[PDB]
Amino acid sequence: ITPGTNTSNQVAVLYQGVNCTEVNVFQTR
Amino acid sequence: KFNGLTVLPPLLTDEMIAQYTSALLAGTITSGWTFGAGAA
Numbered sequence: 001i002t003p004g005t006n007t008s009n010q011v012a013v014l015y016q017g018v019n020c021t022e023v024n025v026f027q028t029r
Numbered sequence: 030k031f032n033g034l035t036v037l038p039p040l041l042t043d044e045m046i047a048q049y050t051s052a053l054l055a056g057t058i059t060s061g062w063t064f065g066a067g068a069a
């Protein structure tokens with residue numbers, strides 16, 4: 001998940017369908 | 030469902046769809062066609 005590279009170099013990562021115990025960290029549905 | 034198959038969730042939950050059908054229905058009852066053309 002990214003804003004544009006013209007806007008920031010920060011990114012976030014989604015592990016689709018994976019529970020966080022198996023992988024700042026947040027458990028979405 | 031596990032041979033590399035996955036099912037992804039929809040962007041809008043059933044509760045978000047039901048808020049949209051409620052808003053459409055409450056607009057239709059209280060304000061006629063006007064909420065489609067501009068302000069209710």
Ligand SMILES: *[C@@H]1O[C@H](CO)[C@@H](O)[C@H](O)[C@H]1NC(C)=O
Nearest residue numbers: 018019020021022027028029
């Ligand atoms: C993730 O796994 C842990 C340990 O099995 C469990 O306590 C937790 O309820 C799970 N959460 C979800 C959203 O699956």
